[PDB]
C-alpha cells in the first residue's frame, strides 16, 4: 500500500497521462504561448505570456494528501520563454507547496 514500487507505478501512470495531454490537447489561443512539457516531475501546460502557471501537486507522490490544495509554479515571460536564471539550465520552478529528503533526493536523481 506504501512502497517504492507502488510510487513508481503511479509515476509511470502519471507520465502516460501527461504524454497523452501533450499530444492530444488543442493548440494554445495564440502563437506566443510557452510550450507544454513533462519535466519528469510535473506536466506543464502551455503557458500564457506574462503569467504564472499553476500545476497541482503531482498525484503519484507518497505524501500527495499532506498537500491536496497545493501547487507547483513556473512563470511564462512576456517573450514566451519559461522564466529561467542565467545561472541555470532548467526553468525556474517553485515546488515549496508540494514538499513532504531521502525520498525527495531519489525523486530528483536522473
Amino acid at each position: 500500500t506504501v512502497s517504492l514500487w507502488e510510487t513508481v507505478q503511479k509515476w509511470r501512470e502519471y507520465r502516460r497521462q501527461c504524454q497523452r495531454s501533450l499530444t492530444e490537447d488543442p493548440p494554445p489561443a495564440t502563437d506566443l504561448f510557452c510550450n507544454r512539457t513533462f519535466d519528469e516531475y510535473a506536466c506543464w501546460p502551455d503557458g500564457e505570456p506574462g503569467s504564472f502557471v499553476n500545476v497541482s501537486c503531482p498525484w503519484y507522490l507518497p505524501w500527495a494528501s499532506s498537500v491536496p490544495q497545493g501547487h507547483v509554479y513556473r512563470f511564462c515571460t512576456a517573450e514566451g520563454l519559461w522564466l529561467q536564471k542565467d545561472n541555470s539550465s532548467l526553468p525556474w520552478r517553485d515546488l515549496s507547496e508540494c514538499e513532504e529528503s531521502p525520498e525527495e533526493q531519489l525523486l530528483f536523481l536522473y
Epitope: 506504501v2 512502497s3 514500487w5 509515476w11 519528469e40 531521502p102 525520498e103 531519489l106 530528483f108 536522473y110
Partner: antibody, heavy 123, light 108 residues
C-alpha cells in the same frame, strides 16, 4: 556503502519452518527503498519471492501462496523471510536485495545484493 | 505472468572477443529490462538497468540494447573476470521474473 547479508540455518527438515534474516548496514531499511527476497534453484531458475517496503508494506509472489511472510525489525535494521512447511523443492540459495528506482524513466531494479545463503531441506 | 527466455543457456568465447547474451520476454516489457551477473562464488551484481543504463562501478565493456520483447547484453571484449552466469529480469509488472541464465566461460 550499503551492505546486505543473509543468515540462517543451512539445513532444515521437511515440513518444518524456514526463517532467514537479512542484516542491512549503511542504510536504514525504514527509508525510501524496498527490501526483497529472491532465491536461486539448482538448475539456474531464479525466482522472485516478495518484498517489504520501507513502510512495512509487503507484496508476495502468488506462487508462494500462503507459505511466505516478510517482516522487519527497524530498531535492528534487519528484515526476515519466513517460509512455512518447506519441502525439498525449497532447496535453494536465498538472496536479499535492495530495490531502487529512477524517476527519470520509471525503472525499478535491484541495485545491491547479499552474498546469498544456501539452504538444504532434507530429513 | 511474464516468461523470460534466454535461449542460449551456455556460451564459450575467447579472451578479448565480443560476447552477446540475448533475452526474450513473453510480452512487451517497455524497456524495463535489467541484467545481473552471478559469479561462480555466488556473488550477484547489477550490471545494466532499463535496457541500457550502466550501473555505476560496472565496466564500460558492458552495454545493453533492445525494445519490445527482445533484449541483449554485450561484452565488448571478454576478460577472465567476466566468467559468470548472466540473468535478465523484467521489472515491468509483478511478479518480477528472471531469465534462466547464460553461463559464460573461456574458449581455449
Amino acid at each position: 556503502d550499503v551492505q546486505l547479508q543473509e543468515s540462517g540455518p543451512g539445513l532444515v527438515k521437511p515440513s518444518q519452518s524456514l526463517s532467514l534474516t537479512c542484516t542491512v548496514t549503511g542504510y536504514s531499511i525504514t527509508s525510501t527503498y524496498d527490501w526483497h527476497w529472491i532465491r536461486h534453484f539448482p538448475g539456474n531458475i531464479l525466482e522472485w519471492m516478495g518484498y517489504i517496503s520501507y513502510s512495512g508494506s509487503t507484496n508476495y509472489n502468488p506462487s508462494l501462496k500462503s507459505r511466505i511472510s516478510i517482516t522487519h525489525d527497524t530498531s535492528k535494521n534487519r528484515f526476515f523471510l519466513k517460509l512455512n512447511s518447506v519441502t525439498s523443492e525449497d532447496t535453494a540459495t536465498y538472496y536479499c536485495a535492495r530495490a531502487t528506482a529512477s524517476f527519470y524513466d520509471g525503472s525499478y531494479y535491484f541495485d545491491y545484493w547479499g552474498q546469498g545463503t544456501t539452504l538444504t531441506v532434507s530429513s | 505472468d511474464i516468461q523470460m527466455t534466454q535461449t542460449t543457456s551456455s556460451l564459450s568465447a575467447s579472451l578479448g572477443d565480443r560476447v552477446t547474451i540475448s533475452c526474450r520476454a513473453s510480452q512487451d516489457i517497455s524497456n524495463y529490462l535489467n541484467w545481473y551477473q552471478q559469479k561462480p562464488d555466488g556473488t550477484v551484481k547489477l550490471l545494466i538497468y532499463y535496457t541500457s543504463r550502466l550501473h555505476s562501478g560496472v565496466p564500460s565493456r558492458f552495454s545493453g540494447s533492445g525494445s519490445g520483447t527482445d533484449y541483449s547484453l554485450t561484452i565488448s571484449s571478454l576478460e577472465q573476470e567476466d566468467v559468470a552466469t548472466y540473468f535478465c529480469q523484467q521489472g515491468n509488472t509483478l511478479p518480477f521474473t528472471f531469465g534462466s541464465g547464460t553461463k559464460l566461460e573461456i574458449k581455449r
